[PDB]
Design an enzyme around this catalytic site. Structure first.
Site, PDB file in Angstrom:
ATOM      1  N   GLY A  69       0.745   3.846   6.073  1.00  0.00           N
ATOM      2  CA  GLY A  69       0.125   4.608   4.975  1.00  0.00           C
ATOM      3  C   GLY A  69      -0.286   6.031   5.346  1.00  0.00           C
ATOM      4  O   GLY A  69      -0.104   6.458   6.494  1.00  0.00           O
ATOM      5  N   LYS A  83      -5.979   4.127  11.798  1.00  0.00           N
ATOM      6  CA  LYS A  83      -6.077   5.442  11.140  1.00  0.00           C
ATOM      7  C   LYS A  83      -6.600   6.517  12.113  1.00  0.00           C
ATOM      8  O   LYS A  83      -7.686   6.394  12.673  1.00  0.00           O
ATOM      9  CB  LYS A  83      -6.952   5.371   9.850  1.00  0.00           C
ATOM     10  CG  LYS A  83      -6.869   6.613   8.952  1.00  0.00           C
ATOM     11  CD  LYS A  83      -7.713   6.381   7.664  1.00  0.00           C
ATOM     12  CE  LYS A  83      -7.425   7.427   6.600  1.00  0.00           C
ATOM     13  NZ  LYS A  83      -8.260   7.228   5.379  1.00  0.00           N
ATOM     14  N   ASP A  96     -11.999   7.516  -5.231  1.00  0.00           N
ATOM     15  CA  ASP A  96     -10.548   7.611  -5.149  1.00  0.00           C
ATOM     16  C   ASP A  96      -9.854   6.255  -5.260  1.00  0.00           C
ATOM     17  O   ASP A  96      -8.852   6.010  -4.599  1.00  0.00           O
ATOM     18  CB  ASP A  96     -10.133   8.343  -3.867  1.00  0.00           C
ATOM     19  CG  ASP A  96      -8.778   9.063  -4.014  1.00  0.00           C
ATOM     20  OD1 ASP A  96      -8.500   9.684  -5.068  1.00  0.00           O
ATOM     21  OD2 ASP A  96      -8.008   9.031  -3.053  1.00  0.00           O
ATOM     22  N   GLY A 154      -6.175  11.361   7.333  1.00  0.00           N
ATOM     23  CA  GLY A 154      -5.600  10.626   8.464  1.00  0.00           C
ATOM     24  C   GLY A 154      -4.466   9.696   8.064  1.00  0.00           C
ATOM     25  O   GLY A 154      -4.568   8.987   7.060  1.00  0.00           O
ATOM     26  N   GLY A 187      -3.617   8.855   4.461  1.00  0.00           N
ATOM     27  CA  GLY A 187      -4.909   9.253   3.838  1.00  0.00           C
ATOM     28  C   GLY A 187      -5.214  10.749   3.882  1.00  0.00           C
ATOM     29  O   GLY A 187      -4.524  11.509   4.565  1.00  0.00           O
TER      30      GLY A 187
HETATM   31  O1  LIG Z   1      -7.106   4.868   4.445  1.00  0.00           O
HETATM   32  C1  LIG Z   1      -5.986   4.767   3.935  1.00  0.00           C
HETATM   33  N1  LIG Z   1      -5.533   5.653   3.070  1.00  0.00           N
HETATM   34  C2  LIG Z   1      -4.215   5.637   2.428  1.00  0.00           C
HETATM   35  C3  LIG Z   1      -3.220   4.496   2.671  1.00  0.00           C
HETATM   36  C4  LIG Z   1      -3.788   3.473   3.598  1.00  0.00           C
HETATM   37  N2  LIG Z   1      -3.237   2.312   4.004  1.00  0.00           N
HETATM   38  C5  LIG Z   1      -4.137   1.738   4.834  1.00  0.00           C
HETATM   39  C6  LIG Z   1      -3.783   0.420   5.420  1.00  0.00           C
HETATM   40  C7  LIG Z   1      -4.796  -0.286   6.062  1.00  0.00           C
HETATM   41  C8  LIG Z   1      -4.540  -1.530   6.635  1.00  0.00           C
HETATM   42  N3  LIG Z   1      -3.284  -2.033   6.576  1.00  0.00           N
HETATM   43  C9  LIG Z   1      -2.264  -1.378   5.955  1.00  0.00           C
HETATM   44  C10 LIG Z   1      -0.903  -2.021   5.927  1.00  0.00           C
HETATM   45  C11 LIG Z   1      -0.472  -2.829   6.986  1.00  0.00           C
HETATM   46  C12 LIG Z   1       0.807  -3.432   6.940  1.00  0.00           C
HETATM   47  C13 LIG Z   1       1.664  -3.266   5.858  1.00  0.00           C
HETATM   48  C14 LIG Z   1       1.284  -2.492   4.764  1.00  0.00           C
HETATM   49  C15 LIG Z   1       0.024  -1.874   4.770  1.00  0.00           C
HETATM   50  F1  LIG Z   1      -0.337  -1.119   3.722  1.00  0.00           F
HETATM   51  C16 LIG Z   1      -2.502  -0.122   5.368  1.00  0.00           C
HETATM   52  C17 LIG Z   1      -5.322   2.457   4.967  1.00  0.00           C
HETATM   53  C18 LIG Z   1      -5.121   3.579   4.217  1.00  0.00           C
END
Ligand SMILES: O=C1NCCc2[nH]c(-c3ccnc(-c4ccccc4F)c3)cc21
Length: 271
Positions: free
Chosen positions: A19, A40, A132, A23, A21
């Site tokens: 993903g 992150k 958000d 970060g 953010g």
């Molecule tokens: O903080 C953020 N902002 C934007 C997008 C975002 N995504 C995460 C996140 C967190 C934990 N795990 C995953 C993940 C794991 C495996 C496959 C698919 C997934 F989305 C994704 C956190 C954040």
């Protein structure tokens, strides 16, 4: 609380992204356990320190992505904060709905909204507004039928009745798309033909143009469509089919919702 030795002492990192953010998010593995987690990376700053603070306070609350650990490290000659979180392997809410064929029902949408409400309820009762709430931030723990929906990303969070009403607006938007497959940016036929009176009435109270008139979370959670979500009708919704048909426009819908949320956080706005 925040560990000051190298993250790579405890975790093996991937180059693989999960993903992005305000970060970016990396897959990683716990060295002692083997467990797949998510990392992150935030460059240290007031904003990054606040994200860490707010997520830590929220971590452990109902339907919120848990923080496992926080590291403060040097990386590329810069101080950074690494948030380790549970791996949300089921991915995005609406991607999961899209992949169903399978009936997606109004009673099912009501349980998802109640899941999200319980997160907002916890946040608001601890005086955190998220600000958000949107598709990219609503994730499933696994790909299985028993996956849990959780909220993440505290990058815009603030610890204002106004700020809290921006989460309520998000809830109305998310509920709108959930029942039909398209955003409010009317309840048109035939998508909306068979939807609850109760569901439409709740959406109207959430999408109130005037923020001071929008339903609160206490009022959302007490609504019969939320409070009695388990006796909501099982009427087949158009959602998964529409999401599938409109998939080529999904990025645009996300961008619009992101744009709309950012407009809501400006200190001074046009009329
Ligand atoms: O903080 C953020 N902002 C934007 C997008 C975002 N995504 C995460 C996140 C967190 C934990 N795990 C995953 C993940 C794991 C495996 C496959 C698919 C997934 F989305 C994704 C956190 C954040």
């Amino acid at each position: 609380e925040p560990k000051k030795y190298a993250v790579t002492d405890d975790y093996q990192l991937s180059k693989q992204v999960l993903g992005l953010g305000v970060g970016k998010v990396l897959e990683c593995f716990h060295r002692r356990t083997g467990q797949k987690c998510a990392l992150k990376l935030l460059y240290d700053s007031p904003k990054a320190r606040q994200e860490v603070d707010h997520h830590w306070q929220a971590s452990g609350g109902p339907h919120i992505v848990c923080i496992l650990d926080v590291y403060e490290n040097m990386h590329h000659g810069k101080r950074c904060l690494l948030i380790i979180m549970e791996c949300m392997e089921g991915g995005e809410l609406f991607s999961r709905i899209q992949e169903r064929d399978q009936a997606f029902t109004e009673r099912e949408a009501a349980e998802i909204m109640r899941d999200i409400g319980t997160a907002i309820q916890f946040l608001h009762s601890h005086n955190i507004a998220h600000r958000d709430v949107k598709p990219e931030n609503l994730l499933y723990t696994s790909k299985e039928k028993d996956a849990v929906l959780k909220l993440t990303d505290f990058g815009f969070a603030k610890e204002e009745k106004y700020d809290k009403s921006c989460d309520m607006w998000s809830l109305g938007v998310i509920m709108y798309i959930l029942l039909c497959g398209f955003p409010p940016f009317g309840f048109p036929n035939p998508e909306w033909s068979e939807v609850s009176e109760d569901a439409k009435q709740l959406i109207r109270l959430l999408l109130k143009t005037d923020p001071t008139e929008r339903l609160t979370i206490t009022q959302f959670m007490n609504h019969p469509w939320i409070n009695q979500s388990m006796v909501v009708p099982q009427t087949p919704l158009h959602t998964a089919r529409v999401l599938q048909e409109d998939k080529d426009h999904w990025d645009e819908v996300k961008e619009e919702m992101t744009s709309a949320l950012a407009t809501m956080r400006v200190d001074y706005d046009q009329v």
